[PDB]
Amino acid sequence: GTQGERCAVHGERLHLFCEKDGKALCWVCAQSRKHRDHAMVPLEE
Ligand SMILES: [Zn+2]
Structure with missing residues (x-):
């Protein structure tokens, strides 16, 4: 239920x-x- 899909490989927010x-x-x-x-x-949303 993790609202926010992060780049799990590095551990950062992704765009x-x-x-x-x-x-x-x-x-x-x-x-x-x-x-x-x-x-x-x-991701320009
Ligand atoms: Zn990445």
Whole structure:
């Protein structure tokens, strides 16, 4: 019932939406050498 989906890997609040993956990441995961940056917009809600 945890109101607020945090990035559990690091232990921080997340704001990023992979449109390509259809998943909610953080800025740090946008900066990740893993995740191919293209269809990803930050959570501007
Ligand atoms: Zn992250």
